[PDB]
């Protein structure tokens, strides 16, 4: 993991939820999604020209969504249709991601966590279905799919498991890769 896993951030990021939890869209596009410390952005009508490779997107149950144009994903939560979010590798080795509004937790701190998933301990109320954008189920878990190692090559050592999620009333049987 060249300069990727060395100093991303602790899995127990400091600060907690001071009170009510809000919805925020900080439009976070600074660096590649090397680790789970990221803030995706909502992208509407996209130019389906530079997109290359699979465009798997996470319902969470991953589904291949081919662009409806050649030389389009209006992100919405499954209760309102569509998918939570997803990522793609395009152009010259540049990886990009998109997802619902990055879920922020009301609190104080120099580096308060812009919770993209789970983060229950920092905020007892943070459920994936309401506070999640990308494929990270928990700060140390992923939804394993064939291109998972092509998108996050720093998650080789993780072990696979079979899990049953319940989003609303719908039941998702899925494999998830987590370490120990």
């Amino acid at each position: 993991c060249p300069e990727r896993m060395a100093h991303c951030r602790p899995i127990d990021e400091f600060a907690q939820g001071w009170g009510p939890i809000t919805y925020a869209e900080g439009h976070g596009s600074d660096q590649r999604p090397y680790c789970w410390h990221y803030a995706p952005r909502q992208c509407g009508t996209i130019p389906a020209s530079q997109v290359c490779g699979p465009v798997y997107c996470f319902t969470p149950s991953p589904v291949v969504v081919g662009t409806t144009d050649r030389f389009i994903l209006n992100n919405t939560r499954p209760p309102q249709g569509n998918w939570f979010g997803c990522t793609w590798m395009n152009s010259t080795g540049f990886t990009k991601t998109c997802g619902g509004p990055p879920c922020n937790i009301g609190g104080v701190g120099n580096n308060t966590l812009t919770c993209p998933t789970d983060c229950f301990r920092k905020h007892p109320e943070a459920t994936y279905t309401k506070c999640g954008s990308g494929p990270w189920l928990t700060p140390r878990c992923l939804v394993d799919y064939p291109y998972r190692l092509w998108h996050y090559p720093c998650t080789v050592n993780f072990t696979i498991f079979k899990v049953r999620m319940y989003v609303g009333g719908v039941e998702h049987r899925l494999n998830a890769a987590c370490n120990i």
Partner: antibody
Amino acid sequence: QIQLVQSGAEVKKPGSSVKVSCRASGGSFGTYGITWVRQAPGQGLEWVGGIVPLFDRPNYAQKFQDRVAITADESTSTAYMELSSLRFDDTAVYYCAREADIVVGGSSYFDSWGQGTLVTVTK
Amino acid sequence: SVLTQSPGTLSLSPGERATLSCRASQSVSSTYVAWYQQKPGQAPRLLIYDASIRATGVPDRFSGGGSGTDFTLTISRLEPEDFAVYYCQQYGGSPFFGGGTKVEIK
């Protein structure tokens, strides 16, 4: 798969809090869930709650919310259940069982159980 | 009152048949049911999960079944060591146990 369920508080007082422990010997702690189910002297079993100590988010039944907490210490491979605001109806035996499969937001069936710890509430 | 067992208390003698019933109220439940057994004091045991899959260590006498609703646990060739208080629970998204029949083998 030997649950040396440690006795908690055999005798308690109304309005007090009770911590019940459950120790898992062998296996890999942090991959299978621990579930707490209680049964009164003569009644049916009641699902108190459960936890999976890898997705840090315990599950509680509908009628045991805002009054029960569940924690898991992986460094010592133990699972604790803290029940507050005890009532004279709480007199029962609390078991500790293993979830067969990992579930998020749901429950599962219990494979191997453990010795029950009596919990007597009296004045 | 979601899951209930009609027969309530029961009493038979060895070499007989008992057919306990667990009546899921409204939802088909997607075929998620489990059956247990509780001796007079010992810990419960798991007999059937999914109503059609048998665990390890229990004989084939405990044959369970059901489709959509009204899952059943058929006990054939009753033995003296079959007295218990059987239980039925449905897991998944709506976890809840059921009523306890009171087989009275003698």
